[PDB]
Amino acid sequence: NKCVNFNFNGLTGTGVLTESNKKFLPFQQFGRDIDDTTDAVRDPQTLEILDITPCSFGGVSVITPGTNTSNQVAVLYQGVNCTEVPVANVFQTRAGCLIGAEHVNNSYECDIPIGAGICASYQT
Amino acid sequence: VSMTKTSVDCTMYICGDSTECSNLLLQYGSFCTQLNRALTGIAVEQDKN
């Protein structure tokens, strides 16, 4: 549950390692998906499966009312969850995490698009 | 009516986590940002549709 680089038995990778419900047969050591990409490994000392996810990344987009309106902005980190963004007025969305905008219960029209039914707007 | 919006960190696809790839891929120019313009373009096009 940390972003680490790893080497297991010479197999080198990167990601968040975590406990797995999968069950390899006694002679398999590394899992590969349809994509032929390494999604799980048996630990060579506890002999239990780790699932592995390439650790948090995405685009950032800057939300902006225009310069001639204001010098104020908000940041959307894309797919990145709000528990992983502070390394770089917080609201968590199916688009990821948005910071620097007030969440408000008033459904207006889409002034700036964000995704998953979310838009942002600049106002009083 | 739409197709799945995709995006690529072009440096991460090409050879991310490696510095010598950051040094070498810079020699090629905008051949990442052009793709990021082309795909962020496709993605806004799907919500237009």
Binding site: G13, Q78 | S7
Partner: peptide, 24 residues
Amino acid sequence: VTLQKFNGLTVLPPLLTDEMIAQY
């Protein structure tokens, strides 16, 4: 109809959810 990765790829969400297309 039958259907965030190591390789720099991601999938972005559509601006309208399947609830919002049900409403429209």
